[PDB]
Amino acid sequence: SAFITFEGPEGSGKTTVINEVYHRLVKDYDVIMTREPGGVPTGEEIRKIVLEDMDIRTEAMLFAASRREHLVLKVIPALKEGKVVLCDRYIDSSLAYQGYARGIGVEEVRALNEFAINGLYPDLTIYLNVSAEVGRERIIKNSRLDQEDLKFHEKVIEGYQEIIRFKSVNADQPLENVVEDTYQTIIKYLEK
Amino acid sequence: SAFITFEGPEGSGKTTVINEVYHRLVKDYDVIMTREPGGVPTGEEIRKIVLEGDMDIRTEAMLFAASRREHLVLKVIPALKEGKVVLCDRYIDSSLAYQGYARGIGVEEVRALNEFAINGLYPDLTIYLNVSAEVGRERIIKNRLDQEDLKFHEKVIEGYQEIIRFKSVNADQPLENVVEDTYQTIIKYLEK
Ligand SMILES: [Cl-]
Ligand SMILES: [Cl-]
Ligand SMILES: [Cl-]
Ligand SMILES: [Cl-]
Ligand SMILES: [Cl-]
């Protein structure tokens, strides 16, 4: 089994990467791709409460609760089946977004997440490392960004910077290269 | 203002005491009493998810942590800023004794969870209704018990013991006496 998470700011081509890597790994591996809450009912119920000016800490705890449901009801049973699990975003996202970019403190958010994952850290974490400039362009094309969004975007990147199982891939290259690098990085882990 | 919480295991007379002490204090102080989640919408939603649950206890602990903060930010804090005395039935200490000790999640982990949730907002005074396991058992029965229940009850009391802003009150006495002591205990604090 292998628990593989994918991390990165918006504009890192994370969606394309996970989907294309998934499609290539599926040939030889019992692999599944998921993203919290990933269909888990309670997880969905929890998320929805947020979706419906809620305190940022309240939000953080709900996302944490949702994360654990997805972990206990979907990821673990999968890892026990001996499957490779590709997860779009995990504890690191919360650290960079809630802890760093939003101001709660990487400190407290990490303790929260450790409470949620109960020692189950990713076997491998791909960090799609994209510069703010290239990231910004991908974000726009996938729609000029507000001065505030640009700033927050930059803070998320710095957050991940500080944070970095980690295997960084250059997400400033064309997505075809970002896909090849991520795939090789992964096949390398699954073969050793 | 003053944030006063009431703690104690089942069968300690807690409900009767807070209510009787509340009615009595309203006559001479600008006080209100609330019971988590105190009617806060978000609190009721977050809670119901737990009620509609074999749910993982950490998930439960986090959801109840979320509920506690909504109640804190949307109700307790605003009332405290209005110069009011706020009597609260249950707070972090309850979680510590129940989830932390009794349920065996880990006092330290549950503590960290609650600190994230209260963000430094600790009670000014905490009333611990100290009742013996034997008297508590009898009150519960008064209002035969299974062996697991009895032992869980015991763990709860043992947890509170280790946790103990605290002013303990001998809850083995007749309720009438528990209320008086509790009332005199609070009055003392409010007039110092
Ligand atoms: Cl999914
Ligand atoms: Cl399982
Ligand atoms: Cl890189
Ligand atoms: Cl491209
Ligand atoms: Cl009595």
Swiss-Prot record, chain B:
InterPro entries: P-loop_NTPase (IPR027417), Thymidylate_kin-like_dom (IPR039430), Thymidylate_kin_CS (IPR018095), Thymidylate_kinase (IPR018094). Its EC number is 2.7.4.9. CDD domains: TMPK. One of its GO terms (biological process) is dTDP biosynthetic process. Keywords: ATP-binding, Kinase, Nucleotide biosynthesis, Nucleotide-binding, Transferase. ATP binds at G8, P9, E10, G11, S12, G13, K14, T15. Pfam families: Thymidylate_kin (PF02223). The keyword Kinase applies. It comes from the Bacteria. One of its GO terms (molecular function) is ATP binding. GO terms for cellular component: cytosol. It catalyses: dTMP + ATP = dTDP + ADP. Signal peptide: none annotated. NCBIfam families: DTMP_kinase (TIGR00041). Belongs to the thymidylate kinase family. Phosphorylation of dTMP to form dTDP in both de novo and salvage pathways of dTTP synthesis. PANTHER family: THYMIDYLATE KINASE (PTHR10344), UMP-CMP KINASE 2, MITOCHONDRIAL (PTHR10344:SF4). This is Thymidylate kinase. The lineage of its organism: Bacteria, Bacillati, Bacillota, Bacilli, Bacillales.
